[PDB]
Amino acid sequence: KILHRLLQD
Amino acid sequence: HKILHRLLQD
Amino acid sequence: SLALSLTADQMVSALLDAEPPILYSEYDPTRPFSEASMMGLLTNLADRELVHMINWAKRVPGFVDLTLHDQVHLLECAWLEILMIGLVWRSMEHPGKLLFAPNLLLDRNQGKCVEGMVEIFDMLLATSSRFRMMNLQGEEFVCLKSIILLNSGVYTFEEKDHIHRVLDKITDTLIHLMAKAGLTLQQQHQRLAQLLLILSHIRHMSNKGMEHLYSMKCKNVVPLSDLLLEMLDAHR
Amino acid sequence: SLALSLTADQMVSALLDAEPPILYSEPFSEASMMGLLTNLADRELVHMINWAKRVPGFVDLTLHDQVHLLECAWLEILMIGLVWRSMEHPGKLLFAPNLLLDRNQGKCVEGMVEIFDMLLATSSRFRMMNLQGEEFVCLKSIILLNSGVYTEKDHIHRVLDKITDTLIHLMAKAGLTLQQQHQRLAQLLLILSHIRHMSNKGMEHLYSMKCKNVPLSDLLLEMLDAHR
């Protein structure tokens, strides 16, 4: 999920 | 009219 | 104007006395549940509750001061919210279950009988658990229910200021109830916030419930009363 | 844990500093305007995500909880933003400094005019209340933390109580009496239910557009699928 990766950054 | 409209008139 | 003159205790007493009765469903235990038969019971119950809700609404201080146009519009906007907060309230002492009627107590597994209704049941159950966690009082409940009636449609409109004054009055009543309960000044505005934030979730459940009910209508699952059809059309 | 240690002034400062920028957009048509709005929403989402991480107490949560809260609240957060920017523009929605739409331009898209009206009415309400920027950033943080809390949970409510304390602090600082503070707090929070309502309608509207073409970004599609 794109949201998942943007938060993890 | 609406039923609601008449029910309020009770 | 009479609403604005009432004391906080007069507000509480008025709202308490105005409370609608708890109705029974037309539940028939001789036949098994179907999607249609379950939706039939729930909408039949809702339809009969609506009639009593209208009587209740007229006894909510300040509501009768509004035009018929405004009364209709507030009820059209808030009816499912009001049905749900009442349901959630009377389900408090039944953990994991929803007390639609004294002869109709359902758990979430029975909500799976109807397509897409279990998601709504889960939200209703969670709200019921939240009220139970906060130890919601009956006097607070009737304040919240009256707030929903006056607020949910107030913005999709001098008469607007009147509603807001009555709403501010109920705010005063809530604070007074909490102070009377012995809560500190900090705890008072904190709890007031907690209770009002729940209304946003009740709004959410109502919108989802409206979509689901509309879906059941457009698939001819259950015949809706002309009243329910009108209340539904108001949201579409 | 540090969020609970913040004073009321620390909360306001933290939220004000975490504020996302006001982005810009690109004879309009239906697909044109929808293209502009969804393109704008997509870029705003990227800024919102990094904004959430700067909201005190949010990073304490698990990634799962962070994802869930943003999935539930993203359109609400975009809408209260729009409504806030449109405060000083009666009858107009300020999607972007170069994109100022009245209610009639909302008729260019089918069914959107109803949502436009609700947004305008909300903006008018904020203007009537003379909503302050400090109050706004508090309300927006509340939306993020509240909208998905019922769908660890005590920490969320701890932070939520802190923001309530922060709002009351701003009102007491503004010279409001105790009765006025409580009333104004109630007024502001009840608006969030209307904002919830607008988001639900918008999610239904946006899902109607997807099914029937005009394009949407992959991120936007995922945020949309989360409500279905």
Ligand SMILES: Oc1ccc(C2=CC[C@H]3[C@H](CC[C@@H]3O)C2)c(Cl)c1
């Ligand atoms: O006091 C009541 C009666 C009925 C219902 C209903 C329960 C579920 C159906 C419908 C809303 C969505 C479903 O179609 C009405 C509720 Cl929440 C409360």
Ligand SMILES: Oc1ccc(C2=CC[C@H]3[C@H](CC[C@@H]3O)C2)c(Cl)c1
């Ligand atoms: O900052 C923004 C950007 C875009 C939008 C959009 C405005 C309305 C459209 C869609 C949601 C519902 C409509 O399709 C997104 C909003 Cl509210 C705020």
